[PDB]
């Protein structure tokens, strides 16, 4: 068929304070738009992390990794943070819990 396989709805990407501070330290605007395009076609494209409440990790820069939460009803993505491949790739409980907290902090801003 003509239209490519995936989702084609108006969508919103929402940078967090962290992601906005550190985005351009990592991604050229081409890389960033390619990333949002990929998620817009397919949310659920990132690998789930458990204990987080639905946060996902995508690895496309290279070794850049973004962590995001897609909001089911409002069709907004929360871009939580971006970290490089070499750098802290060690996932522990203090991390998963605080990520879940800030994620829920955005989540309950628009009921």
């Amino acid at each position, epitope marked *: 068929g*003509l239209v*490519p396989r995936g989702s*084609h709805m108006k969508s*919103v*990407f929402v*940078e967090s304070t962290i992601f906005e501070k550190y985005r351009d330290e990592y991604l050229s*605007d081409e890389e960033y*738009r390619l990333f949002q*395009a990929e998620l817009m076609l397919n949310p659920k494209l990132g690998d789930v992390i458990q204990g987080t409440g639905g946060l996902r990790k995508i690895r496309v820069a290279g070794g850049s990794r973004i962590i995001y939460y897609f909001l089911d009803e409002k069709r907004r993505f929360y871009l939580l943070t971006i970290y490089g491949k070499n750098e802290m790739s060690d996932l522990n409980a203090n991390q998963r819990k605080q990520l879940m907290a800030f994620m829920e902090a955005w989540r309950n801003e628009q009921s």
Partner: nanobody, 124 residues
Framework: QVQLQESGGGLVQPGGSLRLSCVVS????????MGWFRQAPGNQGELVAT???????????SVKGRFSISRDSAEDSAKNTVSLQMNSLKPEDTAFYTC??????????????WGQGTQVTVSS
């Protein structure tokens, strides 16, 4: 909130012209950048064109000379309409075309808004 409604698309003869269009309204915000993306089936998509709030544009190499991005501020009160003008359409330009716009409301989030998209089929 911020409203995005887009227009244009369909289906065109080679060498013909089509204007895609895409409007962002709501109340006031600071606009950073804004562009168009395209994706044909089976392969990775490609960013078609970009324009900073300063006018700085990029275009991809395959569309150089033929597509043009332009903009309309509506006094910079209100809305900006972004237009993709496509001329001398080649069949390689057949793709699903989406627009986007980064922008930051007062005391608000740096968001990039994305369109539904629209299929553009350039077939002999």
């Amino acid at each position: 909130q911020v409203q995005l409604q887009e227009s244009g698309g369909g289906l065109v003869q080679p060498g013909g012209s089509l204007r895609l269009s895409c409007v962002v309204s709501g109340d006031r915000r600071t606009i950073y950048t804004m562009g168009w993306f395209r994706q044909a089936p089976g392969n990775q998509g490609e960013l078609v064109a970009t324009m900073t709030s300063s006018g700085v544009t990029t275009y991809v190499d395959s569309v150089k000379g033929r597509f043009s991005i332009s903009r309309d501020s509506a006094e910079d009160s209100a809305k900006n309409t972004v237009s993709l003008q496509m001329n001398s359409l080649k069949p390689e330009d057949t793709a699903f075309y989406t627009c986007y716009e980064e922008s930051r409301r007062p005391l608000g989030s740096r968001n990039t808004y994305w369109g539904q998209g629209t299929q553009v089929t350039v077939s002999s």
